[PDB]
Structure formats: structure tokens, C-alpha cells
Amino acid sequence: VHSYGYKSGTRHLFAKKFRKHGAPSVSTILTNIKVGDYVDVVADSAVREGMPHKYYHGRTGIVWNVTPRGVGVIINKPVRTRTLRKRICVRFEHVRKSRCQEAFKAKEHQFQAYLAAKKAGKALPPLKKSSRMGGIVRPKNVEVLARRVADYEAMVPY
């Protein structure tokens, strides 16, 4: 980076992948964003206006303001001794709802559905056990490890 411009470092970060070129698909226009929701900021390059800065590409935060064509996101940018909490304004083409929170909110459902399942039983599925615990092994086939005379002429090709 010689010139320290606005979008000074990027012929790759902002390039579209090979044979993925195109303008943004419908499915990302028909997503809707509620305030408080987590989001990935990934800048699409086929929409000029509204891009996030080079730093924010690839981060996640909590949407806060929602405007007709815009959004806004709260992202943690570490600075000298501290993390400022930055508010950026993006055109939502660059925004995708994050799956980050997901496996947790699925752990919470599979607890409650578990709990209402014990309430009056029906019992419950069995608890899987460790693979690291003991056992006798009954080998179906057994072979020998050795270094072969032939193994060396394979490592000098040609």
C-alpha cells in the first residue's frame, strides 16, 4: 500500500471469486433484518455504493439502526490499549445473518425439548458413551509394518 486511500489495499479482498460473478441474488433481497440480530459484514463487490471499509470485511456484530436501504452494525475494533465499539453504516447487500449464535440456541432448544420429554418420561434416548474406554479388539486382518527395499526406489523418481 503506497497511497493509503479509502480502498487502498484490495485487488483480492474485493474481487469476486472465479465464476461466481454476478449482481446480488434475490434471496439476499428477501432476507429481512431485525435490530439486535447478529450479522456478518462481507462486502459484495457488484454493488458500488454502501460498501464497508476494508477493515470491517469479515467481521460480525449486532445490527442496531435499520434504514430503508441501509443497516448499521456494532463491531469491535481493537485500538491501542482498548476496544472501541464501532458503528458502521452499510447497504445490507454486504450483510448476511450470521450463524454464529446458532449451535448455542440449538443447545437451548434441545435442552427444553429434552426437559419436557422427561416431565412425563416417555423415557429418553440413551446416553452415548466414550470411545476412549477400554475394550478387546478382534482383528479381522493383520499386516506387518516394515521398510521395504522397494520403498526406496519409489522415493527417487523420475
Q: After which residues is the chain broken (C to N over 2.5 A)?
A: none
What does the longest C-alpha to C-alpha distance in the chain come to?
73
Nearest to 66 by CA among 42, 31, 30, 90: 90
The amino acid at 74 = I
Partner that binds at residue 49, options another protein, RNA, none, CB closer than 5 to 8 Å by kind:
none
**In the stretch 24-63, what mask flags binding to RNA with x, by CB under 7 A?**
----------xxx---------------------------
Q: Exactly one of 3, 131, 139, 146 binds RNA (CB under 7 A); which one?
A: 131
Q: In what order do the strands lie in the sheet with 83-90?
A: 83-90, 71-78, 59-66, 38-41, 95-97
Site for another protein contains 30 (CB under 8 A): no
Residue 17 vs 107, nearer CB to RNA: 107
Site for RNA contains 129 (CB under 7 A): yes
For residue 126, the minimal CB distance to another protein (Å) is: 18
In the complex, the residues that contact RNA under the rule CB under 7 A are 34-36, 107, 110-112, 114-115, 127-132, 136, 138
